[PDB]
Design a protein around this ligand. Structure first.
Ligand SMILES: *[C@@H]1O[C@H](CO)[C@@H](O)[C@H](O)[C@H]1NC(C)=O
Ligand SMILES: *[C@@H]1O[C@H](CO)[C@@H](O)[C@H](O)[C@H]1NC(C)=O
Ligand SMILES: *[C@@H]1O[C@H](CO)[C@@H](O)[C@H](O)[C@H]1NC(C)=O
Lengths: 200, 218, 65, 65
């Protein structure tokens, strides 16, 4: 949760067709655009953010509904966020012992600015200055594990969430959806649209 | 040093086929019989302004003149375009790089801060190139076929056909040429008006500038 | 501070060292400190439930206060 | 679908029964239907605000799915 792999999706013919059509995705909610507009506007560049959270924390990723995850780990501004995709990874994750690698930050100075990543791990509280060590009445090491054992309920089962929030209107278009085509005819009065060149 | 570009630097302005027709177009062209700053840097690559597109030529048939860096501040602060030949792949990097003092290249790297776009593609010889940047599109024209009408001088007529188009959409004002460690022309083009002649094939065989001579205007 | 606050402040150190072990990607010791965390969780719950506290044999961190 | 979409889809049924009550021109059950409609409106408002969820004693429609 505390980090996220942001990747460059550009120079692409992105279908968005296999997406939103398969039932593997538990939540497919879009805000800036209506989910049905596969070839919508040929937007400029795409942001992709991937992380794994609990079942209940899904509602907090959306704009508003700020919670512990939203306040100190991932801040999403109230703008045209593309879509939110989340599914259940109880089969892949959640070993019998329980995955302990997934971490979340419970203590931080202030709410993270939108799309700001904090990889640093350090002691936070201080106050009485007993810190610079893990032992202290107020040091409170920030990161804490999740405990994603299979016996946990769906509320605490791990969910694999990817936030597709494409960049909007900032440069000439580079990535867009596929253009439908059809067979051609000869020796008939037919109006044509060859690569945008219209005519009859 | 200065040199006269007789009638070189005419390119196909669009992707429209024509045959046996005289078409007049108004576009950014290099005027006939202009002055080009002859550079002869051997045993010296200054930063030159872009100034709404540039002309370029060369005469050495080996890999010594390699790259063309474009940008506005030549620092990691601002997005900077880079084109370098590897003799097997042409690498195009628009990502931010810091200042290069004495770049040596041939078949410099400081840091790729905020890397965003990348691209990969495929008598002596003449490599005449035309660089243009309009409405966020960077167009590169080329012609690698040399004609020995006269020796040691670039005289004759040759048309330039487009090679690549980049939708980078960046602001560039200065450009520089990259060399190695151990003769290229520069011309600026203005919005002139030309009358171009097409062959039976869609090839341009002759062009006439019409801000140079009352006969030409006629 | 009584017993509740002491145990609540006690258990967070074990949470921190579990997090550090997970960062170290060694899950051998991580299981042991996770068992310690669960022990102290049930200890706090038992104390708050109003039952005898098993403070006699539970492990000790470096410091009482 | 979480909870938000479920309540949003439930509220339409109660607006519909309000509509039928209005059409049948007796305002008796119409008032009760409107009261539970505002109750659900507050329910979605508080759930979207991020507040404790009273999904325990609120009235329920015929169907969970
Ligand atoms: C182009 O040149 C070779 C050919 O395979 C190889 O190193 C690579 O594909 C390219 N080199 C680059 C991108 O530096
Ligand atoms: C360049 O690197 C710095 C590192 O502090 C970073 O803050 C900045 O965003 C980078 N440049 C761009 C254009 O992102
Ligand atoms: C046109 O192209 C053909 C292709 O071989 C060539 O033979 C011919 O000479 C060219 N010019 C004309 C005027 O046909």
């Amino acid at each position: 949760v505390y980090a996220w792999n942001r990747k460059r999706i550009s120079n692409c013919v992105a279908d968005y067709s296999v997406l939103y059509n398969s039932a593997s995705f538990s939540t497919f909610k879009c805000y800036g655009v209506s989910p049905t507009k596969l070839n919508d506007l040929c937007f400029t560049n795409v942001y992709a953010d991937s992380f794994v959270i609990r079942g209940d924390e899904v509602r907090q990723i959306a704009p508003g509904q700020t919670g512990k995850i939203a306040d100190y780990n991932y801040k999403l501004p109230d703008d045209f966020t593309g879509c939110v995709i989340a599914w259940n990874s109880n089969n892949l994750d959640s070993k019998v012992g329980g995955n302990y690698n997934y971490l979340y930050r419970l203590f931080r100075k202030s709410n993270l600015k939108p799309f700001e990543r904090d990889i640093s791990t350090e002691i936070y509280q201080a106050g009485s200055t007993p810190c610079n060590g893990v032992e202290g009445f107020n040091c409170y090491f920030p990161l804490q594990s999740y405990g994603f054992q299979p016996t946990n309920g769906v509320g605490y089962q791990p969910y694999r969430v990817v936030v597709l929030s494409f960049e909007l209107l900032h440069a000439p278009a580079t990535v867009c959806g596929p253009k439908k085509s059809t067979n051609l005819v000869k020796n008939k009065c037919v109006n044509f649209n060859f690569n945008g060149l219209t005519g009859t | 040093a200065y040199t006269n570009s007789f009638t070189r630097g005419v390119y196909y302005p669009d992707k429209v086929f024509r045959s046996s027709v005289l078409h007049s177009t108004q576009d950014l062209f290099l005027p006939f019989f202009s002055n080009v700053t002859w550079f002869h840097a051997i045993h010296d690559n200054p930063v030159l302004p872009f100034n709404d597109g540039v002309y370029f030529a060369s005469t050495e048939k080996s890999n010594i003149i390699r790259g063309w860096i474009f940008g506005t501040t030549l620092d990691s602060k601002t997005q900077s375009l880079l084109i370098v030949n590897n003799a097997t792949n042409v690498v195009i990097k628009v990502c931010e790089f810091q200042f290069c003092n004495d770049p040596f290249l041939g078949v410099v790297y400081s840091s790729a801060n905020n890397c965003t776009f990348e691209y990969v593609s495929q008598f002596k010889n003449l490599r005449e190139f035309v660089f243009k940047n309009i409405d966020g599109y960077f167009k590169i024209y080329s012609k690698h076929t040399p004609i020995n009408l006269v020796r040691d001088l670039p005289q004759g007529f040759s048309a330039l056909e487009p090679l690549v188009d980049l939708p980078i959409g960046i602001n560039i004002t200065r450009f520089q040429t990259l060399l190695a460690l151990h003769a290229y022309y520069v011309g600026y083009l203005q919005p002139r008006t030309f009358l171009l002649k097409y062959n039976e094939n869609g090839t341009i065989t002759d062009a006439v500038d019409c801000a140079l001579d009352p006969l030409s205007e006629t | 501070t009584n017993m509740l606050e002491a145990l609540q402040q006690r258990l967070q150190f074990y949470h921190g060292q579990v997090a550090r072990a997970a960062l170290e990607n060694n899950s051998g010791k991580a299981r042991r400190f996770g068992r310690i965390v669960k022990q102290y969780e049930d200890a706090i719950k038992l104390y708050k439930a109003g039952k005898p506290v098993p403070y006699d044999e539970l492990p000790v961190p470096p410091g009482f206060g």
